Amino acid sequence: NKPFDAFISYSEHDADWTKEHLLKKLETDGFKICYHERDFKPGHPVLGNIFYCIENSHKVLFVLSPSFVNSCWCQYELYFAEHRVQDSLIMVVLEDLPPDSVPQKFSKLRKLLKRKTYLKWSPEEHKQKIFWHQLAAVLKTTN
Amino acid sequence: NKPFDAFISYSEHDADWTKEHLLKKLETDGFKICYHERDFKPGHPVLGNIFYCIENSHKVLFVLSPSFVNSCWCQYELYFAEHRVQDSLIMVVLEDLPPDSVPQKFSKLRKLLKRKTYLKWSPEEHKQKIFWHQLAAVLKTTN
């Protein structure tokens, strides 16, 4: 029984979409989210380290796009979650990733993408409505 | 026989000092340095991932200060090096770290600081001259 439903990570390039769509919808619908842009407090002994969100969240959710995979900072975030975290991972593909673009040593993300375990965003309202129900569903699954 | 003598990591707050003093001196004196601000190439299959510098550098050098320890991004960099890398680590204390400020789960940095294995910067020219000779010395040690 973690206090947060998900720790969410996303690239700077995807920040506007994530805040305006993903975060807003999830929080309006009652999910409790931990994310560093809001919840990391530099110098705070509890809130100012990177273990806080992931240790207190049921799921880890990554927003995936080329900008995420090619970002130095996002690769560090991927490394951390891969080595800290399993069924607790949730991948949202916002934009298609070119084949073999994920660095070879990110075995977990590679196998998860290869095995089609992600949810994919769509521009069409009908597919988006399904997306949001399926995202809520996967956030509530066991680990 | 690695192509780079060191992969160097430093906080945004310390970027001016690191480029103007550490990087300039080391490169003027013949050391070959890998650091992401210059050498990470987004999207490049070889140069656009975080494993390139560390895998091709003899040493890993961190510039330490409160701004480093309290930075979300620097904590991710610390996690990566701690789990990837041992004698290959080199800590340069640019500014004193308050006691117990390093998050508890960074065991390696904590034990290394506790055991006084770092080099400390000084404002005094005489101590700086010694610092630079000692930094060159430690960069050339075996791993």
Author numbering:
A (entry chain A), B (entry chain A): 704 to 788, 793 to 850
Task: Quote the paper.
TLR15 is a TLR unique to birds and reptiles that responds to virulence-associated fungal and bacterial proteases. The ectodomain of a TLR directly senses a PAMP and the intracellular TIR domain dimerizes to initiate a signaling cascade. Collectively, our structural and mutational analyses suggest that TLR15TIR employs the BB, αC2 and DD regions for dimerization.
To provide the structural mechanism whereby TLR15 mediates signaling via its intracellular TIR domain, chicken TLR15TIR (residues 699–868) was expressed using the E. coli expression system and purified by chromatographic methods in the presence of β-mercapto­ethanol. The TLR15TIR protein was crystallized using ammonium sulfate at pH 6.5. The TLR15TIR crystals diffracted X-rays up to 1.90 Å resolution. The crystal structure of TLR15TIR was determined by molecular replacement and refined with an R free value of 23.3%. Given that β-mercapto­ethanol was used for the purification of TLR15TIR and resembles the curved linear shape of the extra electron density, the Cys777 residue was modeled as an adduct with β-mercapto­ethanol. Because the TLR15 Cys777 residue is readily modified by β-mercapto­ethanol or gluta­thione, we propose that the Cys777 residue is highly reactive.
